[PDB]
Design a protein around this ligand. Structure first.
Ligand code: ATP
Ligand code: ADP
Ligand code: ADP
Lengths: 71, 686, 254, 890
């Protein structure tokens, strides 16, 4: 979990998450979102970059922790 | 030193001054039991309560004659709880009263026995006197588990006393039994007995939920011999030539002697060997087979025809020497077997043990049937000194002192502490010497084996000193709170508070379990001698190293020192290493001149013997100091050693677990080597 | 339940080829964990009070999930046993002559199993194959037959290992190789090393029909005083026992 | 008979007859001591124990039963001889300890008990049990209880021991963990209790054979079988097993008997010298995990000494005659086996101990002039330094010769030493020299473990289809064995460069031994052809099992074999010959080398600076090769600055005068930034101050400013960095925005070093406290380069080489074998840099190896890796690595 959040926070994208059918479906929904948000559809890599930037500007992760500094 | 520490106590301010007078103090100190009457040495005017005098005398006994500490503690318990408090333990326990009334049928009676002992006979006699049937069951068979379970199921509804034999073999089935015993039992007469030896793998849950009875083999040769004679069938000892009865008596004597010497493990046989009933059965089988082979018929065969060599060799090399690890315990096993198993053992004046209790002897029973040997054994005196075993009489004092220290340690472990840990760590830092220097290395002295050994020793000592200083200063810093402890520091504190030596501080051989304060003290002494060695090496390169009167006990690897001395002597001449043998000269004056091949060592202690000039003689006072023991390497002539010399092992600790080397000593004109071997004489570095 | 009603509509069996050029099922983890998750979800929803949108949508599919689970957790055992026994019966020779009834029963069983595999391959849909009648009963029959024939193979291995007890030092696969390659004796020489202490080879005749002696790692030969002919003792255990006996006798005479 | 045997072992014998001879010397020596003891003891009666305690043999041909013709009696035991052919085996010297073991074990066998020898490992408990079992002709099995213990097999193994009459020995039975120990103890107890009833007083004659229960069924127990439990014991077996203390064997007696069986006159003196020497080597020599001074090593040294003596006498014959010095032959055998494993500190110690135990005699080494000449030709063209003794390069060539000797003897060689020693160079030069001298081609397969999964190293079976797919090493072994392609005339050296680890050598333990066969999970066996050598090029043996280290010989490459002078010679030889641009470049390189030669000598500027920098403090552990390589890369850039200067100025090229003053100052600049570029500013100032007092290169005039603050420019002048920091005014919308850098002192010099070390395509790691500006300093130089495209990549604890693999698949394409498979970026002409965020973050394994770090090292050093799909070597074309990390103390 922390390994995934490391990439979700530092870079905002998780590379080893969307593979195969999930990747294609994500491309479909994100290109549809680009069309309904007035955004021009681009190549797969540029569309993925736009999706990652959309995640950057539309995702906030909050961590709540024990005040135990040893943890 | 004990007087000084006791004088530190406020109740004994005047203790040197008061012991100056009262010339009876020496007689009291030499008294056999100086706890019945103890001189008044505490400075108290008004207090006269019995408890106060008892505890003051207890502290005095800890100071003077600590071997009587057990007896003094017994009298202290007598004063604080009446002179009948422990007497219930002396009488033989009666299982009927305990089991009938205050043992619930839910609770299983645990028939705990020390290994080498069986306790089924007690409850068998219990059932015989109470005429209650027992469904005794042996544990270990796969079908035995099902049979025991069926007996449990069919006995709870009828209250039949179930018995399991050696149930400690199976821990998982015992867990299952403990879990299932929570279910209620219809019958109240039910009593469940688990006979099991003292094995640490036995479930703790069973121990909590059951009544634990501990049985031990009563100490003594007489009890051991009664036990052995009861174990051996009457038929197996009576048949064949009548000499087999005396052979069995001799075997029982030997087995009892070697088991009662196990109690005096340091001074007896170096380590606690397992000499249970299996070895005695094997020896009995050996005697049976060899008397059958030698004496085919039933005639009274002559003792000269007894296969003495076969029995001695088989019991020294195969069934009793098969568990002996080192050379010297094997040598003493051989000494016992030669002394006992001989054709002279069938005479009438043959002594089982000489020098016993000063000048008396233990005679052979002139018997032909097992009955007369048994009657002789039961006629043995109740009093038994360690001299029965060949050991000196003060082995009892040594054992009693060890037991007293063990009781003190147990009570100490049966007892915020930031400040106490801080002050003890600061005291250690103050007492422990500063860093160790090894700033001498020239090309010409790399050839010197002594320099190489001393350099490696000083380097290892300096590294370990730096590690100990850093860790202990870290502990100090954590004590005030300006530094935060970690996992290594946490376990270090856990070890230091309980006074157990940290595993990271152990890099040289130390006795198996000792107080950290003793470790710090001997570490400080070792560092001090290493600083002296380094100073000598700074003063001179190859002249002072030879003239170092080094303390062999303080070296981390003294065997490496012996090897380096041999190497140095080999290089000094054209001789090779294997062409040298060690010659040892004990002197009196510390300023004795050292020869070219001679090497002086200090701190060696001789156990159970003393030397006038260089000739050993037996002494009742153990730990005789050897001042300036000189080690000489000489060209060996490959000749046989005479019969007037003994080879003593040289151990490093009070415990005899590691050999450094062996020293040959000329004994006096009266003593014989066998007595030295059986008295446990050795040389100790510490 | 929305995703549950559609996950079964699109679900391939993911067929794979075999060394015998036959179709098999490789997917088992996704075929068990997903079904268990779906059945747990439908059980929770039926138990849960919040179900007044799905008054009857999972009871008609809970039995479907149970049928899937039973069919396929029998199918996995069936296919594993079948591939293991196929390897045993095809890799080693003389399996037709030795245990003929077992071999013919396994041939009929393999014919039925391959027919079933062709049927499931023609329609690689799990719904399309659950609708086929008789699949469950045929599968349980097939599994029980496989169990019996595997037990019989184990019993035969035990009875052949009981004779010439040196076979207890080799595994099941090694002993199957030993007892199957009766004609190709040259493959036995790799197993004599573990069955004996020092014997590594057997000195055979020119046509490898008479055992003239034994050999070792170094190459030291022990010619038999009386050679044993495998022709007169065709069974392998018989002439192996005779080789051991003649080795003892030859050592004694020498 | 002993004299005839000893005269017949000096001459030439076949190996089988040699072993028969040696067995005969062993027995006849034992008989000689036994008879001599009987004579000295004045034994007259034949029933006396002193004779009756010896193993005695009674043979009666008249009996018709084969098994009972020979009877063996020890003291009162009467065993028959199991007439089972043992082969040739190996014979133990009957020392008094071995005699006591025989007596005790035979007594245990008559009592229907078991034998339980105990003591330290290497004493001979298992071998003594096996020797006793072979003396009685029984089929003895040894079960290794430390590891590779097949529990499922033991059920039928015990039944085989029962129904055959075979023995069983458990080597280090206590090494078993409690779970399997308890069940093995239960089975052993069942067997022992079944066997104890064979000696029933009332049921001695067993009409019905006694059976036990092992496989949930009754199995007959033959009286001939036995079980032995060697240790280093459970309460089940305490009452059913006799124990013997095998603490210390008689090494002097074993050595003397073995030497006498090797034909050595005065074998007693040689034994009583060599045994104390092996004792000293365990005390005076520093403890290493690979040192073996035990009994097995002593026996190996003794047999090698016998071979050496026979070689000497047969060489003298072709020029009875027994006048050779035996001690010098023994010393050569010791030194030809122990010196290669010795660390540099122990080498003088070994000869000091040799002069102690064997005074006066000296060790003379085989010259091998034939190979030492082809080494001079393989070197001097690979730009390496050659030596012939105390001269420079002597230690390295001696290590190469020792490596050659071990390759001749063993087949699983293991080159071990601190990183930076010439291990890889040694074995490469040896391979080329062997190919030249013997005319046999040498092909090296550098398989890197810990970079791929063990499944991809060997292979696995899919539990559904049961199809077998081979791993990397397995496929290499297939291509060596199955396909010939000059098999016997190609030297296949499968170097396992990396870190040694138990997990991937479990399968190799069957290959390193004399078996030379690999057992696969599918059951197939592949036998290693004799030309194959399994070479382990590793840095240390901290995490190597005793089995793997003891199963193969080795040569230790200490850090002292490769001196700094050798590395400087390599740098200058490559500089003068290899063009930096792949003709004027060579000329300027030779001029630079000539100018900078007096500093790259023994002592001098670079050596003194490196020695002084080693006593400073750096953020990372200081490695000599790291600083030297960074210095060499910077100096290589200093020779490209001249190339660009000449290109920009076709007329008036910089002559030797300008070049000299440029490179003298650039050498100091590169020394300062390479030997102290990983340390604090105070350490940099200290190194500069030390340089100022030991150099003759003109330095900055101002003493109050450190040399680290200046630049050499191109005119050979110290231009301060502060003169090259512009004053920029960023527009308002770009205030503190990402990827906005304001020039300063650090960003103008670190950028210079990044340009220097990226123009070489050399991997680098930026180390510093968090937020100090490592990432910003890099991207201010990467994206400035037009063709240096950057691929963002983040390293965490769970990072594995598969991350790099997916990055390569997404951004790079595999060329269809132009010359082998080559991994190249999708776009042409552009270089990919994989920025390594927190390169030291990945988790330390339990065996001290980060898999991803080793994976990227494989392709930094060897220029590629191995695909896991077809097990073929793929080569990186235009892939570059850059790292960044916080200090390791964090
Ligand atoms: N005479 C020489 N012989 C060998 N290497 C030399 C010599 N002179 C200089 N060198 C340099 O020393 C290094 C030798 O290290 P080598 O590549 O053999 O080590 P490795 O075993 O691959 O790795 P590591 O030392 O990190 O374990 C190379 O950089 C080589 O250029
Ligand atoms: N009496 C002996 N004579 C000759 N070699 C011996 C003798 N005792 C032990 N050895 C050698 O010692 C080596 C290791 O002995 P081993 O049986 O492994 O001891 P352990 O089982 O106690 O580790 C063996 O290779 C063996 O050849
Ligand atoms: N010239 C400069 N020197 C140092 N730091 C700077 C400079 N200009 C900007 N910074 C700031 O320093 C920070 C360093 O960030 P970053 O490169 O992520 O640190 P690191 O690479 O050490 O993790 C940046 O956020 C940047 O805003």
């Amino acid at each position: 979990f922390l390994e995934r959040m490391n990439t979700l926070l530092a870079n905002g994208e998780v590379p080893g998450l969307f593979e195969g059918d999930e990747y294609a479906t994500l491309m479909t929904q994100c290109k549809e979102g680009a069309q309904k948000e007035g955004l021009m559809l681009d190549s797969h890599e540029e569309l993925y970059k736009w999706f990652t930037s959309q995640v950057i500007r539309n995702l906030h992760v909050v961590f709540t922790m024990n005040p135990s500094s040893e943890g | 030193e004990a007087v000084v520490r006791l004088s530190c106590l406020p109740a004994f301010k005047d203790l040197i001054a008061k012991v100056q007078a009262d010339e009876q103090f020496g007689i009291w100190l030499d008294s056999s039991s100086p706890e019945q009457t103890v001189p008044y040495l505490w400075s108290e005017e008004t207090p006269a309560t019995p408890i106060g005098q008892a505890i003051h005398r207890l502290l005095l006994i800890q100071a003077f004659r600590p071997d009587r500490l057990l007896a003094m503690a017994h009298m202290f318990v007598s004063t604080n709880l009446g002179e009948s408090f422990m007497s219930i333990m002396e009488q033989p326990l009666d299982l009927t009263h305990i089991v009938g009334t205050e043992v619930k049928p839910n609770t299983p009676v645990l028939m705990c026995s020390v290994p080498g002992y069986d306790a089924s006979g007690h409850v068998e006699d219990l059932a015989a006197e109470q005429n209650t049937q027992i469904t005794s069951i042996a544990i270990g068979s796969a079908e035995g588990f099902n049979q025991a379970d069926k007996a449990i199921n069919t006995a709870v509804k009828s209250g039949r006393w179930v018995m399991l034999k050696n149930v400690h073999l199976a821990p998982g089935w015992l867990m299952q039994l403990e879990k299932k015993l929570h279910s209620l039992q219809p019958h109240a007469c039910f009593r469940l007995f688990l006979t099991m030896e003292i094995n640490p793998k036995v479930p703790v849950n069973l121990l909590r939920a059951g009544r634990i009875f501990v049985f031990e083999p009563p100490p003594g040769v007489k009890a051991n011999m009664l036990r052995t004679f009861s174990s051996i069938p009457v038929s197996r000892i009576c048949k064949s030539p009548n000499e087999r009865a005396r052979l069995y008596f001799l075997l029982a004597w030997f087995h009892a002697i070697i088991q009662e010497r196990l109690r005096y493990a340091p001074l007896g046989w170096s380590k606690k060997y397992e000499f249970g009933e299996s070895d005695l059965r094997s020896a009995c089988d050996t005697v049976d087979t060899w008397l059958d082979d030698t004496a085919k018929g039933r005639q009274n065969i002559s003792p000269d025809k007894i296969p003495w060599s076969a029995l001695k060799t088989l019991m020294a090399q195969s069934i009793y020497g098969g568990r002996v690890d080192n050379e010297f315990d094997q040598r003493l096993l051989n000494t016992f077997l030669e002394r006992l198993f001989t054709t002279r053992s069938f005479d009438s004046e043959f002594k089982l043990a000489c020098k016993v209790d000063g000048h008396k002897d233990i005679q052979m029973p002139d018997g032909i049937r097992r009955e007369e040997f048994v009657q002789w054994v039961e006629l043995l005196p109740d009093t038994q000194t360690p001299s029965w075993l060949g050991l000196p009489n003060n082995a009892e004092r040594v054992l009693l002192t060890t037991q007293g220290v063990d009781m003190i340690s147990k009570m100490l472990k049966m007892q915020a502490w930031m400040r106490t840990l801080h002050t003890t760590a600061s005291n250690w830092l103050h007492l422990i010497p500063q860093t160790l220097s090894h700033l001498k290395r020239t090309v010409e002295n790399i050839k010197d084996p002594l320099f190489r050994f001393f350099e490696r020793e000083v380097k290892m000592g300096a590294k370990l000193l730096q590690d100990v200083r850093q860790d202990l200063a870290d502990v100090v810093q954590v004590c005030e709170g300006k530094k935060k402890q970690t996992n290594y520091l946490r376990t270090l504190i856990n070890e230091l508070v309980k006074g157990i030596l940290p595993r990271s501080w152990s890099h040289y051989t130390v006795p198996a379990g000792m107080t950290v304060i003793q470790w710090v003290s001997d570490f400080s002494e070792r560092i001090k001698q290493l600083q002296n060695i380094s100073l000598a090496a700074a003063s001179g390169g190859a002249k002072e190293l030879k003239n170092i009167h080094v303390c062999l006990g303080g070296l981390f690897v003294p065997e490496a020192y012996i090897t380096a001395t041999r190497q140095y002597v080999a290089q000094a001449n054209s001789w090779s290493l294997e062409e040298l043998c060690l010659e040892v000269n004990v002197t009196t004056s510390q300023g004795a001149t050292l020869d070219a091949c001679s090497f002086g060592v200090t701190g060696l202690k001789l156990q159970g013997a003393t030397c006038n000039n260089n000739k050993l003689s037996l002494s009742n006072a153990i730990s005789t100091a050897l001042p300036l023991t000189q080690l000489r390497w000489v060209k060996q002539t490959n000749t046989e050693k005479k019969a007037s010399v003994v080879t003593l092992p040289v151990y490093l600790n009070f415990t005899r677990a590691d050999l450094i080397f062996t020293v040959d000593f000329e004994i006096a004109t009266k003593e014989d080597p066998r007595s030295f071997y059986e008295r446990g004489v050795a040389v100790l570095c510490t | 339940l929305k995703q549950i009603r559609e996950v079964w509509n699109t679900y391939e069996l993911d067929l794979v080829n075999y060394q015998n050029k036959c179709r098999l099922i490789r997917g088992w983890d996704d075929l068990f964990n997903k079904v268990k998750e779906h059945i747990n979800s439908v059980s929770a929803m039926k138990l849960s009070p919040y179900y007044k949108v799905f008054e009857e949508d999972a009871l008609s599919w809970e039995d479907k999930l149970n049928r899937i689970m039973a069919l396929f957790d029998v199918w996995i055992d069936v296919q594993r046993r079948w591939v293991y026994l196929e390897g045993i019966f095809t890799g080693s020779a003389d399996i037709k002559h030795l245990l003929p009834v077992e071999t013919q029963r396994f041939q009929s069983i393999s014919t039925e199993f391959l027919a079933l595999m062709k049927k499931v391959s023609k329609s690689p849909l799990v719904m399309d194959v659950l609708n086929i009648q008789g699949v469950q009963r045929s599968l349980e029959r097939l599994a029980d037959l496989l169990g019996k024939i595997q037990k019989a193979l184990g019993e035969y291995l035990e009875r052949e290992r009981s004779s010439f007890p040196r076979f207890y030092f080799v595994g099941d696969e090694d002993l199957l190789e030993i007892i199957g390659n009766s004609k190709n004796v040259a493959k036995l020489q790799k197993h004599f090393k573990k069955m004996f202490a020092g014997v590594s080879s057997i000195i055979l005749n020119e046509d490898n029909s008479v055992v003239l002696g034994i050999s070792s790692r170094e190459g030291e030969e022990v010619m038999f005083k009386t050679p044993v002919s495998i022709t007169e003792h065709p069974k392998i255990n018989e002439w192996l026992t005779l080789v051991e006996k003649e080795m003892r006798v030859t050592l004694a005479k020498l | 008979t002993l004299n005839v045997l000893a005269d017949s072992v000096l001459m030439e014998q076949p190996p089988l007859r040699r072993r028969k001879l040696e067995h005969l010397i062993t027995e006849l020596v034992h008989q000689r001591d036994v008879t001599r003891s009987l004579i000295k003891s004045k034994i007259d009666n034949a029933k006396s124990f002193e004779w009756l305690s010896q193993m005695r043999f009674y043979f009666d041909p008249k009996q018709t039963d084969v098994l009972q013709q020979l009877s063996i009696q020890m003291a009162n035991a009467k065993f028959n001889y199991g007439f089972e052919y043992l082969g040739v085996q190996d014979k133990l010297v009957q020392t008094p300890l071995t005699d006591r073991c025989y007596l005790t074990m035979t007594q245990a066998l008559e009592a229907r008990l078991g034998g339980s020898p105990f003591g330290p490992a290497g004493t001979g408990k298992t071998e003594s049990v096996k020797a006793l079992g072979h003396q009685l002709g029984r089929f003895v099995l040894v079960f290794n209880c430390d590891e590779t213990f097949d529990f499922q097999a033991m059920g039928r193994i015990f039944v085989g021991l029962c129904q055959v009459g075979a023995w069983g020995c458990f080597d280090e039975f206590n090494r078993l963990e409690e779970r399997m120990l308890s069940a093995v103890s239960q089975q052993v107890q069942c067997i022992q209790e079944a066997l104890r009833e064979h000696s029933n007083p009332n049921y001695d004659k067993t009409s019905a054979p006694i059976t036990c229960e092992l496989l949930n069924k009754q199995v007959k127990v033959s009286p001939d079988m036995a079980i032995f439990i060697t240790m280093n014991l459970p309460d089940n077996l305490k009452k059913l097993f006799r124990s013997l203390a095998m603490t210390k064997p008689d090494r002097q007696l074993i050595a003397q008997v073995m030497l006498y069986s090797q034909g050595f006159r005065t074998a007693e003196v040689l034994a009583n010298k060599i045994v104390p020497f092996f004792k000293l080597c365990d005390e005076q020599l520093s403890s290493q995990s690979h040192y073996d001074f035990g009994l097995r090593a002593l026996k190996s040294v003794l047999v090698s000494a016998g071979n050496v003596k026979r070689e000497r006498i047969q060489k003298i014959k072709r020029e009875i005659a027994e006048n050779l010095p035996e001690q010098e032959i023994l010393i050569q055998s010791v030194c030809e086996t122990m010196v290669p494993k010795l660390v540099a500190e122990d080498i003088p110690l070994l000869f000091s101990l040799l002069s102690d135990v064997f005074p006066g005699v000296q060790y003379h080494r085989g010259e091998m002039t034939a190979l030492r000449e082809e080494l001079k030709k393989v070197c001097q063209e690979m730009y390496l330094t050659y030596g012939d003794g105390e001269e420079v390069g002597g230690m390295w060539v001696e290590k190469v010769l020792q490596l050659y000797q071990i390759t001749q003897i063993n087949h699983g060689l293991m080159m071990v030493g601190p990183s930076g020693s010439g291990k890889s160079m040694a074995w490469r030069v040896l391979l080329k020299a062997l190919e030249r001298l013997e005319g046999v081609e040498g092909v090296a397969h550098i398989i890197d473990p810990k970079a791929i999964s063990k499944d991809h190293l060997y292979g696995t079976l899919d539990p559904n289809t049961r199809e077998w797919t081979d791993g990397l090493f397995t496929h290499v072994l297939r291509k060596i064995i199955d396909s010939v392609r000059g098999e016997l005339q190609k030297r296949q050296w499968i170097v396992f460069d990396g870190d040694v680890d138990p997990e991937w050598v479990e399968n190799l333990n069957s290959v390193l031994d004399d078996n030379k066969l690999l057992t696969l999970p599918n059951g197939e066996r592949l036998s290693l052809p004799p030309n194959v050598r399994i070479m382990f090029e590793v840095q240390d043996l901290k995490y190597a099992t005793l089995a793997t280290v003891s199963r193969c010989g080795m040569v230790w490459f200490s850090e002292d074999v490769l001196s700094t002078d050798m590395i400087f010679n390599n740098f200058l030889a490559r500089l003068r010959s290899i063009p930096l641009d792949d003709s004027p470049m060579l000329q300027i390189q030779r001029d630079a080398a000539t100018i900078m030669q007096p500093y790259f000598t023994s002592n001098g500027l670079v050596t003194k600076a490196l020695e002084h920098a080693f006593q400073l403090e750096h953020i990372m552990d200081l490695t000599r090769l790291r600083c030297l390589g960074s210095l060499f890369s910077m100096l290589h850039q200093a020779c490209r600055n001249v190339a660009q200067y000449n290109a920009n100025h076709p007329d008036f090229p910089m002559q030797i005068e300008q070049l000299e003053r440029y490179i003298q100052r650039y050498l100091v600049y590169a020394i300062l930034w390479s030997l102290s570029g990983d340390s604090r500013l105070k350490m940099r100032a200290e190194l500069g101050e030390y340089i100022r007092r030991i150099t003759t290169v003109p330095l900055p005039t101002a003493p109050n400013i450190p040399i680290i603050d200046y630049e050499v420019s191109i005119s050979g002048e110290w231009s301060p960095w502060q003169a090259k920091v512009p004053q920029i005014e960023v527009e308002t919308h770009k205030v503190a925005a990402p990827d906005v850098v304001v020039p300063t002192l650090d960003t103008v010099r670190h950028e210079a070093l990044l340009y220097t070390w990226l123009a070489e395509h050399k991997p680098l790691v930026l180390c510093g406290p968090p937020g100090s500006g490592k990432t910003m300093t890099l991207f201010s130089a990467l994206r400035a380069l037009p063709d240096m495209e950057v691929v963002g990549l983040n390293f965490s604890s769970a990072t594995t080489p598969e991350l790099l693999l997916k990055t390569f698949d997404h951004y790079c394409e595999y060329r269809r074998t132009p010359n082998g498979v080559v991994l190249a970026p999708v776009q042409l002409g552009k270089w990919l840099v994989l920025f390594c965020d927190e390169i030291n973050l990945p988790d330390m394994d339990k065996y001290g190896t980060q898999r991803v770090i080793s994976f990227i090292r494989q392709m930094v050093e060897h220029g590629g890796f191995y695909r896991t799909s077809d097990q073929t070597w793929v080569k990186l074309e235009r892939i570059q690595f850059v790292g960044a990390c916080n200090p390791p103390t964090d």
